[PDB]
Point group: D2
Chain length 97, copies 4
């Protein structure tokens, strides 16, 4: 039994509107923690252009394609299991033109 711990935290990013952007984390824990994603403190809605990818043992990626100005904001991830919780956030800046 091991509390969830980030091995790789979210990092701030910027992209141009219409382009794609990727955020990435690695989070470990026994049992494998479940994740909750938020934007500006509200539950993240994936919609048509956002996807969450799970690879490897602890690797998760948040991918946005066809980014829009509205996608600008603070993205938070929270990992939880029976032993504890841990959370981090980063900012996405979608630039105009």
């Amino acid at each position: 039994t091991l509390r969830p711990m980030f091995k790789r935290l979210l990092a701030n990013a910027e992209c141009q509107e219409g382009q794609s952007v990727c955020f990435e984390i690695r989070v470990s824990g026994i049992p494998p923690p479940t994740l909750k994603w938020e934007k500006d403190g509200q539950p993240l809605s994936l919609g048509p252009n956002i996807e969450i990818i799970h690879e490897g043992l602890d690797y998760y990626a948040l991918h946005i394609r066809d980014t829009l100005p509205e996608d600008t904001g603070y993205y938070r991830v929270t990992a939880t299991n029976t032993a504890g919780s841990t959370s981090c956030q980063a900012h996405l800046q979608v630039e105009r033109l």
Copy 2:
């Protein structure tokens, strides 16, 4: 609060070695269920070419690129929340050249 429930089950799949294969499910639930994937009864090991994608509201896909014969087997997914659990499975046959 409602028990998790597949709106689209895993379906049996087949591909040629070196090609890609995709399993797709759709599971709803309030609260949104957490998923657990298994291969032949053991916890699924996401290798280098295996990824799990979450899209939309309840869309989940298991993607395997560049399949190898080792990927042959029974894949199971369990969706759990505070109201209960649901599970389904299907078979993947990677055919050699």
Copy 3:
């Protein structure tokens, strides 16, 4: 100048309907040759769920997603430059 040559030829393929399939080739030549693709002797119908990919190391790929039974058939690629031309083909079988 140099005649186009297939460093990797098309190989026969099979896929289940609704899944994806990829045909890969490697073509060299100076000048870099232009490619023309056919299916069953007629120009390849470039529509949804079909894409032609070009990447480094002379790599070219024909990718088809969400295959339908109509996608079964013989796919041919012809490479041509000023020094000549070369062609090869392979079969795709869509299965249920």
Copy 4:
């Protein structure tokens, strides 16, 4: 029986952060369908391991540059040619340093 190539959607200036991907998208027509040459700053484009050109339908082409480096900054040009003539357009890519 011929028709000079014409851009229906042109390359657009782009910007991305080092390490992210950037995409350029065009639509070009013409009879017979034109062949394309891609250039970076007047030189033929070398795709390396990180660039792929995707052709969909008859007119759509996308230039995907992944794992961008600041040295990728420059002017990218595409030229479409058939037996009836040629047409060309270019855009600028700025790969901003992570710092």
